Design a protein around this ligand. Sequence first.
Ligand SMILES: [Hg+2]
Ligand SMILES: [Zn+2]
Length: 256
Amino acid sequence: WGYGKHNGPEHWHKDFPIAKGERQSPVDIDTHTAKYDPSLKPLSVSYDQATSLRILNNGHAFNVEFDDSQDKAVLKGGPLDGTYRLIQIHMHVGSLDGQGSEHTVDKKKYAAELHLVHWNTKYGDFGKAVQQPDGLAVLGIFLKVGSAKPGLQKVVDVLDSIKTKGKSADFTNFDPRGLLPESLDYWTYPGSLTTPPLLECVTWIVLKEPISVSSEQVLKFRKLNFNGEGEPEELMVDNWRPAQPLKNRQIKASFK
Ligand SMILES: [Hg+2]
Ligand SMILES: [Zn+2]
């Protein structure tokens, strides 16, 4: 699978029929029909002793991997029951400023969407968690052009190292706290992974406030390649799956 004409989102269902399931992601978040839930506990993001490991271009995105062997960088509270361990961070980006995000707000698309993937500790590990309807919790954060984001610059500075599919680099000492906006107000609903296998295991927590990135950072994030080294260059842009039917799901908001 990929994002091109012959292996993109429209072809996914053939190998992963769950693509046409009852709780696929992303979805459009209609801000008016979203149900404020005053009973949600505040979301707790404890990235305090996160332990980043490596960054890799797997041909679909850059992916910062973390040590999830014990409770280091976790997500709790909010709609979450239990504790969720951060395992990875990757980005969906567009070719133009008005596209790139997977989730949309009242049909509006952002220039990019960062996904911070967490798994439920009551399951043992990531592989086990993805066999559970509540095994993952993914934190989605929109990116809009504005001032440079220091936390993203860390990534920006290593992009040439991992330009093509299969290249990886050491990425220890990266503090994922620098990728978060001031406000933790969010929308939440039960969904899926947005890339094959598209498993329906996730509690999505999409932050209302996007983080800003400079025009220079955005351009650099669009310089990665989908292709492997030595093959014809295919810039890694528009690596996003479109909004999926919401079916009978309800999106809740943590704010009024
Ligand atoms: Hg699942
Ligand atoms: Zn993603």
